[PDB]
Design a binder for this molecule. Structure first.
Ligand SMILES: *[C@@H]1O[C@H](CO[C@@H]2O[C@@H](C)[C@@H](O)[C@@H](O)[C@@H]2O)[C@@H](O[C@@H]2O[C@H](CO)[C@@H](O)[C@H](O)[C@H]2NC(C)=O)[C@H](O)[C@H]1NC(C)=O
Ligand SMILES: *[C@@H]1O[C@H](CO)[C@@H](O[C@@H]2O[C@H](CO)[C@@H](O)[C@H](O)[C@H]2NC(C)=O)[C@H](O)[C@H]1NC(C)=O
Ligand SMILES: *[C@@H]1O[C@H](CO)[C@@H](O[C@@H]2O[C@H](CO)[C@@H](O)[C@H](O)[C@H]2NC(C)=O)[C@H](O)[C@H]1NC(C)=O
Ligand SMILES: *[C@@H]1O[C@H](CO)[C@@H](O[C@@H]2O[C@H](CO)[C@@H](O)[C@H](O)[C@H]2NC(C)=O)[C@H](O)[C@H]1NC(C)=O
Ligand SMILES: *[C@@H]1O[C@H](CO)[C@@H](O[C@@H]2O[C@H](CO)[C@@H](O)[C@H](O)[C@H]2NC(C)=O)[C@H](O)[C@H]1NC(C)=O
Ligand SMILES: *[C@@H]1O[C@H](CO)[C@@H](O[C@@H]2O[C@H](CO)[C@@H](O)[C@H](O)[C@H]2NC(C)=O)[C@H](O)[C@H]1NC(C)=O
Ligand SMILES: *[C@@H]1O[C@H](CO)[C@@H](O[C@@H]2O[C@H](CO)[C@@H](O)[C@H](O)[C@H]2NC(C)=O)[C@H](O)[C@H]1NC(C)=O
Ligand SMILES: *[C@@H]1O[C@H](CO)[C@@H](O[C@@H]2O[C@H](CO)[C@@H](O)[C@H](O)[C@H]2NC(C)=O)[C@H](O)[C@H]1NC(C)=O
Ligand SMILES: *[C@@H]1O[C@H](CO)[C@@H](O[C@@H]2O[C@H](CO)[C@@H](O)[C@H](O)[C@H]2NC(C)=O)[C@H](O)[C@H]1NC(C)=O
Ligand SMILES: *[C@@H]1O[C@H](CO)[C@@H](O)[C@H](O)[C@H]1NC(C)=O
Ligand SMILES: *[C@@H]1O[C@H](CO)[C@@H](O)[C@H](O)[C@H]1NC(C)=O
Ligand SMILES: *[C@@H]1O[C@H](CO)[C@@H](O)[C@H](O)[C@H]1NC(C)=O
Ligand SMILES: *[C@@H]1O[C@H](CO)[C@@H](O)[C@H](O)[C@H]1NC(C)=O
Ligand SMILES: *[C@@H]1O[C@H](CO)[C@@H](O)[C@H](O)[C@H]1NC(C)=O
Ligand SMILES: *[C@@H]1O[C@H](CO)[C@@H](O)[C@H](O)[C@H]1NC(C)=O
Lengths: 196, 281, 363, 178, 49, 49
């Protein structure tokens, strides 16, 4: 529900997609306006020159426009080739997050959002993709005393999974990412060596 | 780099001709502006991955592990670590002559903007990241910094590689001694030779080389009767000066277009390195 | 008296329809919030003297009884030159360009006392309130813009925006530097300046707003972003660049005048096969004496402008002199060939001097 | 403006410490601009450096919020800004002038508080429109400062959790121009 | 092909809904490129498509 | 590094199915990976709780 409300309200969330539209539209508008530039010709309206000058003078004026207009396309295509490489990188990333966050569960920290990744849902957007990363965030932590091992009967016991904790009077074993205490037991500990 | 101030210098006469080429100088200024803002974004996404500036405790009982080379040195104004000084020196022994050259070459409309985050702030983020790690494991990444004894953090690290945690606790003194010695080898290696940091010094040398090329391109004639544009203005009347100036404008503009294009490509190379560095963080 | 031009004086810069768009134009405009001069003519300040025209004039009137009736434009205003008359009589607007001898104090009243005589007339045409006008001489024409608007005020130029439409476009070639108002027995004058303006065209293609791109940093951001609305940020608008306080000239302090006279007025010249060379050095020249002599049939300079030649210094100068046929003068140029250029006097491809020649059939 | 023997340009003529050899007349920059010149009458040597310049970067909240602005004269010292530029001297005469390492900032109120970076400026400085409103300028705060309460026998364990949903957005295509 | 008052080109002359002001002779797209013209005899407006 | 020198849990990084191992082969101006993967097959329905 917060996603729906947020996208209904803030303008800045989809900045990456709107920017990609802005840069490409801005480049086209700039490329068009370069047709109005003279590049030293007596007019940028090419039909003026051919009506106004005789051929051997016109060729001098026309070749200035051809030079500058060709230089305008080379500038456009060069910068579009570089922008295409940037979009390719985002596309390879989005494809990798589709593979690993949507089709899977990713152990990669902060790859599929903050917190431990649970799952992700893809949503389409204009010229882009949106991933709704669902994640588990540890909350409301409490402090405990802890120890690496329990010495019992002269032998050291270690947790099979989890960690030892004490509430100040009693010792328990619990899983690392959620406090669920249990009695320290030969079923949930393993021995190795003496206590020293 | 200001396109008009590079191409024409002080000349209003040249500037009026440069308007007939239209948008090219606005495109070049705007493209370089994009590259410039990209550098702060690249820095932000690597280091500002930590929401809070975590502090180490004064009682640094990390179970025999000795981070003193890598933790901040309080004795200094920048408060870098010891290793962060060795890093800072070996690259600044290049640059971070090029700045002095660029400052002399500033006469031609070059300028270098300061980064948004200073060395002091970036070292403050690396402090927060490092202090978070050793005190709280990966937990400061996923959420709140849940403190855990570092001996037990390292025992979790051992479980991750499929070695049972008793192997840590039974060998902790040996494991700490190996770690402390290996950090020593890093300190010695960076103190010994600059050549390890070649990747950083190369991007510095490439940016210095690009500007020193762009400056020398002003000395070209491009066929004009003089390379020094003030000569033409001193020496020809407008009808003839315009033809000579337009040669310089054309060649100086193609010098910027080449430079800006190559810097746009280098900006993508560095951003790909910053995306990797952010992922490694 | 003075007052402030609250964004008044915008006008449609060209006869092109545009709509739903912001367009940047560079032209002579009245700068926003300009210090405009205020005059109190009524049938009280009656003197209303001649004013300069400068690069162009904005004029406005706040009126109720049609007291202001026209203007005269010109330079000497004394029949020694042509001048432009514009007058609105009780039945017609009238426009004339004649060698007027204007009256010392032109007025209307039953009375028309604008000029004593008119001659050599080369153009004529005959056609609560704020009336606004702009006048320009440009590109071979005299161009006029106007609008009229209802008001209800006792004094001073009102607030708010209104774009003046083009009125008339006179193909008249006269020089203008001064003007004066014609009155029938308050108005405001502002002067145009070259400014960049961003003009907002509505869906009907009227200009509804403008930004004076030079007025202030925010306006410059608006203009450099081509937008009337600017989001939060930092915008690299412009270059700061300190202007020179003054100009310093340091030529060498040599008083010895260069002996050009003895090379041009020599009695006998050298044979072109053995062309003579005289070194000119350690002296001060005055090439304007040579160039302005008008005694030479040909005066061609390579790599140096003849007029700027007097504003430059040289390390050495060599004067070469010889006599050749008139048909051979064309060979005395860089890259030339022929009996003279090939076997008598060859100039380098990158020659930097001047070639001067004149007919000597008298000597 | 200077014109020595026809060699003409613009700069701040300065007494040189650079010891020209007795025959030398000009000193040159790598770009063939004049680094130094000999006066043709006193024969003294002058350094030439250009009159200062820099990017005028204008700092603004949205025009929806305010028409106040601050101006950063990038790379120039505040003692040199007020004289010239296309001219807005009424800014330079204001009470708010502040030398950042990015350049002279005019029209922003320097404050000793620190906040998240609203509008970036450079060298750790940022600016924001805040209260009676003004554009303030401040060293950015990197984040809340936290002591982890580490100890060699203390562990914290989460007793609860939050399921979070995070929106990530990625570009995939751009318009297929030809 | 068209010539209007010297404005020479090629296009598809189409009956315009764009209301030129009485002094305006030509009309342009957002891009500052030709888009309409006033006929010099009928004074109607044509979209130069 | 990840598909040949290791076993990669990254979904669809080393081919379709659960990655077992990959073999590198040289090719002109390139590399070819033969990704060996476990694909589960012939599923049957069950009630579950
Ligand atoms: C977690 O505890 C720390 C201090 O730990 C103490 O020892 C533990 C083993 C356990 O017995 C705790 O109950 C003890 O308090 C707390 O750290 C303090 O935090 C406050 C800010 O909230 C700070 O002002 C104090 O200086 C901190 N004290 C120290 C010694 O650093 C922390 O608040 C506890 N966190 C929770 C969620 O209870
Ligand atoms: C630590 O946990 C033990 C549980 O193992 C707590 O023991 C209980 O204490 C309550 C009184 O508060 C008794 O009513 C229960 O019968 C006790 N249970 C057992 C199994 O002994 C102990 O109180 C806790 N100590 C602290 C300091 O929290
Ligand atoms: C941790 O390492 C530091 C070195 O980085 C040790 O500090 C050195 O201690 C010796 C004495 O044993 C001194 O001679 C050096 O001058 C110290 N160097 C510095 C930089 O302080 C420190 O003793 C080590 N501590 C532990 C507990 O191992
Ligand atoms: C594992 O290797 C380590 C070396 O990395 C051995 O530790 C050394 O042991 C000798 C005594 O045999 C000491 O003199 C050295 O100082 C130790 N080195 C360090 C760094 O502490 C260790 O003995 C080896 N263990 C086994 C079981 O082979
Ligand atoms: C238009 O008239 C003005 C005089 O009103 C002329 O301006 C003078 O020009 C000469 C140079 O030719 C100067 O020496 C005078 O000082 C100028 N006078 C003023 C008042 O500026 C101007 O030259 C005329 N222009 C044309 C094209 O005829
Ligand atoms: C205003 O000026 C016009 C001339 O420009 C006057 O019009 C002329 O009037 C006379 C009669 O007095 C006619 O014989 C002419 O044919 C008119 N000329 C034109 C072009 O119409 C007009 O009368 C003047 N108005 C007043 C009130 O005197
Ligand atoms: C109308 O204009 C002509 C020139 O266009 C004037 O002719 C000049 O007359 C004076 C004598 O009054 C001569 O000295 C000039 O040489 C004449 N100029 C030319 C070019 O011939 C004529 O005077 C003007 N008419 C009136 C009544 O002043
Ligand atoms: C643009 O022109 C149109 C008409 O061409 C105007 O539309 C009229 O607006 C009035 C209100 O002012 C309504 O009463 C009419 O019904 C409208 N007519 C139509 C056909 O819709 C419009 O107001 C003008 N807008 C501007 C900004 O000038
Ligand atoms: C900014 O300019 C001022 C001068 O306008 C500099 O202040 C002077 O600095 C010199 C040393 O370079 C001192 O000897 C003077 O006493 C200072 N004068 C004053 C009035 O402070 C200042 O250092 C310059 N700062 C920068 C960064 O360029
Ligand atoms: C307008 O400028 C004149 C000088 O040109 C000055 O005397 C006058 O005071 C100015 N106007 C105002 C309102 O100050
Ligand atoms: C040659 O003599 C004439 C006078 O007879 C003089 O006007 C001219 O200036 C002289 N030539 C030169 C180059 O001075
Ligand atoms: C110019 O005058 C100075 C004295 O002001 C003198 O020292 C110098 O010698 C003069 N120039 C030459 C070339 O002699
Ligand atoms: C301007 O601010 C108002 C809130 O006062 C908001 O509703 C509106 O969308 C804003 N517009 C822009 C363009 O920021
Ligand atoms: C800001 O702090 C400094 C000390 O760090 C102090 O000297 C200065 O007066 C303070 N300024 C303000 C406006 O509080
Ligand atoms: C030109 O002809 C049209 C009829 O085709 C007519 O309506 C128009 O009035 C004429 N032009 C003038 C100036 O009368």
């Amino acid at each position: 529900g917060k996603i729906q409300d947020s996208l209904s309200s803030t303008a800045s969330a989809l900045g990456k997609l709107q920017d990609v539209v802005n840069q490409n539209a801005q480049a086209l508008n700039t490329l068009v306006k370069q047709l109005s530039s003279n590049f030293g010709a007596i007019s940028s309206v090419l039909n003026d020159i051919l009506s106004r000058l005789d051929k051997v003078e016109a060729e001098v004026q026309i070749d200035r426009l051809i030079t500058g207009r060709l230089q305008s396309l080379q500038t456009y295509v060069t910068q579009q080739l570089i922008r295409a490489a940037e979009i390719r990188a985002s596309a390879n990333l989005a494809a990798t997050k589709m593979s690993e966050c949507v089709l899977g569960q990713s152990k990669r920290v902060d790859f599929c959002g903050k917190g431990y990744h649970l799952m992700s849902f893809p949503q389409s957007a204009p010229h882009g993709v949106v991933f709704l990363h669902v994640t588990y965030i540890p909350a409301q932590e409490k402090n405990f005393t802890t120890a690496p091992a329990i010495c019992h009967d002269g032998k050291a016991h270690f947790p099979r999974e989890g960690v030892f904790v004490s509430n100040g009077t009693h010792w328990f074993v619990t899983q690392r990412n959620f406090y669920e205490p249990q009695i320290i037991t030969t079923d949930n500990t393993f021995v190795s060596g003496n206590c020293d | 780099v200001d396109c008009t101030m590079y191409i024409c210098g002080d000349s209003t006469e040249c500037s009026n001709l440069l308007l007939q080429y239209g948008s090219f100088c606005t495109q070049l200024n705007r493209a370089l502006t994009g590259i410039a803002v990209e550098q702060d974004k690249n820095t932000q996404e690597v280091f500002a991955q930590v929401k809070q500036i975590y502090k180490t405790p004064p009682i640094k009982d990390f179970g025999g592990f000795n981070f003193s080379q890598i933790l901040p040195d309080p004795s200094k104004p920048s408060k870098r670590s010891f290793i962060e000084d060795l890093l800072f020196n070996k690259v600044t022994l290049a640059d971070a002559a090029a700045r002095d050259l660029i400052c002399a070459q500033k006469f031609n409309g070059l300028t270098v903007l300061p980064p948004l985050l200073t060395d002091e702030m970036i070292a403050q983020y690396t402090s927060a990241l490092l202090a978070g790690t050793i005190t709280s494991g990966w937990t400061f990444g996923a959420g709140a910094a849940l403190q855990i004894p570092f001996a037990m953090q390292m025992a979790y690290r051992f479980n991750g590689i499929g070695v049972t945690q008793n192997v840590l606790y039974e060998n902790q003194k040996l494991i700490a001694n190996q770690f402390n010695s290996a950090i020593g080898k890093i300190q010695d290696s960076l103190s010994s030779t600059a050549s390890a940091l070649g990747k950083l010094q190369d991007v510095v040398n490439q940016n210095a080389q690009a500007l020193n090329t762009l400056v020398k391109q002003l000395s070209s004639n491009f066929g004009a009767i003089s390379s020094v544009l003030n000569d033409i203005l001193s020496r020809l009347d407008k009808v003839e000066a315009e033809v000579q100036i337009d040669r310089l404008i054309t060649g100086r503009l193609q010098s910027l277009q080449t430079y800006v294009t190559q810097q746009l490509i280098r900006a993508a190379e560095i951003r790909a390195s910053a995306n990797l560095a952010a992922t490694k963080m | 008296a003075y007052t402030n031009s609250f964004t008044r004086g915008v006008y449609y810069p060209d006869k092109v329809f545009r709509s739903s768009v912001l367009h940047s134009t560079q032209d002579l405009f009245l700068p926003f919030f300009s210090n405009v001069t205020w005059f109190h003519a009524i049938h009280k300040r009656f003197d209303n003297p001649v004013l300069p025209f400068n690069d162009g004039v904005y004029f406005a009137s706040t009126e109720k009884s049609n007291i202001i009736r026209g203007w005269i434009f010109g330079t000497t205003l004394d029949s020694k030159t042509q001048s432009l008359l514009i007058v609105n009589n009780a039945t017609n607007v009238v426009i004339k360009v004649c060698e007027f001898q204007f009256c010392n104090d032109p007025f209307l009243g039953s009375e028309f006392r604008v000029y004593s005589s008119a001659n050599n007339c080369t153009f004529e045409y005959v056609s609560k309130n704020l009336r606004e006008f702009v006048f320009k001489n440009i590109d071979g024409y005299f161009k006029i813009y106007s609008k009229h608007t209802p008001i209800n005020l006792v004094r001073d130029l009102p607030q708010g925006f209104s774009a003046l439409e083009p009125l008339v476009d006179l193909p008249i070639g006269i020089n203008i530097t001064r003007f004066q108002t014609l009155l029938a027995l308050a108005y405001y004058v502002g002067y145009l300046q070259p400014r960049t303006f961003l003009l907002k065209y509505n869906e009907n293609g009227t200009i509804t707003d403008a930004v004076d791109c030079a007025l202030d940093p925010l306006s410059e951001t608006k203009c450099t972003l081509k937008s009337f609305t600017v989001e939060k940020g930092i915008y690299q608008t412009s270059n700061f660049r300190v202007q020179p306080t003054e100009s310093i000239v340091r030529f060498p302090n040599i008083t010895n005048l260069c002996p050009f006279g003895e090379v041009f007025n020599a009695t006998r010249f050298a044979s072109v096969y053995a062309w003579n060379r005289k070194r000119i050095s350690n002296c001060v020249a005055d090439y304007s004496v040579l160039y302005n002599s008008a005694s030479f049939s040909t005066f061609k300079c390579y790599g140096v402008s003849p007029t700027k030649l007097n504003d430059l210094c040289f390390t050495n100068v060599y004067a070469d002199s010889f006599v050749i046929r008139g048909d051979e003068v064309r060979q005395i140029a860089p890259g030339q060939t022929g009996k003279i250029a090939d076997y008598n006097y060859k100039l380098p491809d990158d020659f930097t001097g001047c070639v001067i020649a004149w007919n000597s059939n008298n000597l | 403006n200077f014109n020595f023997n026809g060699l003409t340009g613009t700069g701040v003529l300065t007494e040189s410490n650079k010891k020209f050899l007795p025959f030398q007349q000009f000193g040159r920059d790598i770009a063939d601009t004049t680094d130094a010149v000999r006066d043709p009458q006193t024969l003294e040597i002058l350094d030439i450096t250009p009159c200062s310049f820099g990017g005028v970067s204008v700092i603004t909240p949205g025009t929806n919020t305010s028409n106040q602005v601050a101006v950063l004269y990038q790379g120039v010292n505040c003692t040199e800004v007020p004289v010239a530029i296309p001219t807005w001297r009424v800014y330079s005469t204001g009470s708010n002038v502040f030398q950042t390492r990015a350049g002279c900032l005019i029209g922003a109120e320097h404050v000793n508080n620190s906040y998240e970076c609203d509008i970036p400026i450079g060298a750790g400085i940022c600016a924001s429109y805040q209260t009676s409103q003004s554009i303030i300028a401040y060293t950015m705060s990197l984040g809340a400062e936290n002591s982890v309460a580490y100890s060699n026998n203390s562990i914290a364990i989460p007793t609860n959790f939050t399921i979070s949903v995070t929106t990530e957005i990625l570009p995939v295509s751009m318009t297929k121009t030809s």
